Amino acid sequence: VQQVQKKLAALEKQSGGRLGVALINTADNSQVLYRADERFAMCSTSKVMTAAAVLKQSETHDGILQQKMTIKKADLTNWNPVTEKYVGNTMTLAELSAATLQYSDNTAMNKLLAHLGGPGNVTAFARSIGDTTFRLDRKEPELNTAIPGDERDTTSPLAMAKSLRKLTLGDALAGPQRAQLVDWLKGNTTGGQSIRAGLPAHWVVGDKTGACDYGTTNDIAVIWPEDRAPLVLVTYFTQPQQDAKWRKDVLAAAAKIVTEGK
């Protein structure tokens, strides 16, 4: 265990950046923490709490996920892998949530934020489930500045791990909604070189990555090691240079270190 701590410490030192890790083993509620209470820019990982807020609404508003929103060339941002295919057309909130979570579409995220009434409403949702650390302050793409010392759009590894657990395995969301969030996370297409890369290939994983300024490379996930109790893992990482290159390999290494033998 302290060997795990030594390995994480060495990983961070060799990386030249700041690493934040929080692992929750639901088998016994044990935890592996590294700078777990420190704040890190969430960047696209904030889309999980956002999508979850929409899901929460569907618990009391029948068919909300089928509600349509119009996409216009003017809505496009710096990253629209899915939405650019719908310019001049409509997308359902479910499609927007899927695009946001599985392709990290920025325009999709903004549509969800607009629907919800703004970032503040996502912060409110977080508080409703007991997360007093999480905070969403801006929309896309500004929420990705990840400026050192800035608390806007940040959270801690442990707070995000606990919230991810509550949302996917706990009671923060009702059954159908909980299942939909788990399905969307499992279907993510951008995590291939992150947390997943540090795990045995047949383990089942649901995750949401992040890549923004200051070489900030993030990933939060729920991991099912074969037939054993699921693990909730948050790996956040940021660097000194605003234009630093992303280090998905660092997240993979952190993941292997804390999950080996689980």
Distance in angstroms (rounded) separating the CA atoms of residues 28 and 255: 19
CATH number at residue 17: 3.40.710.10
Q: What is the resolution of this structure in A?
A: 1.9
Domain count, the chain: 1
**Structural domain span for residue 111:** 1-262
The candidate with the shortest Cα–Cα distance to 258, out of 196, 208, 186, 198, is 198
> 59, 142, 151, 260: which one is catalytic?
142
Question: For residue 223, what are the β-bridge partners?
Answer: 205, 231
Helix (H, G, I), strand (E, B) or coil at 233: strand
CB–CB of 215/186 below 8 Å? Answer: no
**46 burial class (0-12, 13-18, 19+ CB within 10 angstroms)?**
buried
User: Is 156 considered catalytic here?
Assistant: no
Give CA 216 to chain center in angstroms. 13
Distance in angstroms (rounded) separating the CA atoms of residues 139 and 19: 25
User: Is 12 considered catalytic here?
Assistant: no
State which amino acid sits at residue 3.
Q
Distance in angstroms (rounded) separating the CA atoms of residues 94 and 176: 13
The candidate with the shortest Cα–Cα distance to 174, out of 55, 63, 85, 50, is 55
- The alpha helices in the chain, defined as continuous H runs, are 2-15, 46-58, 93-102, 106-116, 119-128, 157-168, 175-186, 248-259
Distance in angstroms (rounded) separating the CA atoms of residues 235 and 12: 12
CA distances from 180 to 136, 174, 176, 211 (A): 22, 10, 6, 24
> 44, 46, 97, 194: which one is catalytic?
44
Q: What is the experimental method?
A: X-ray
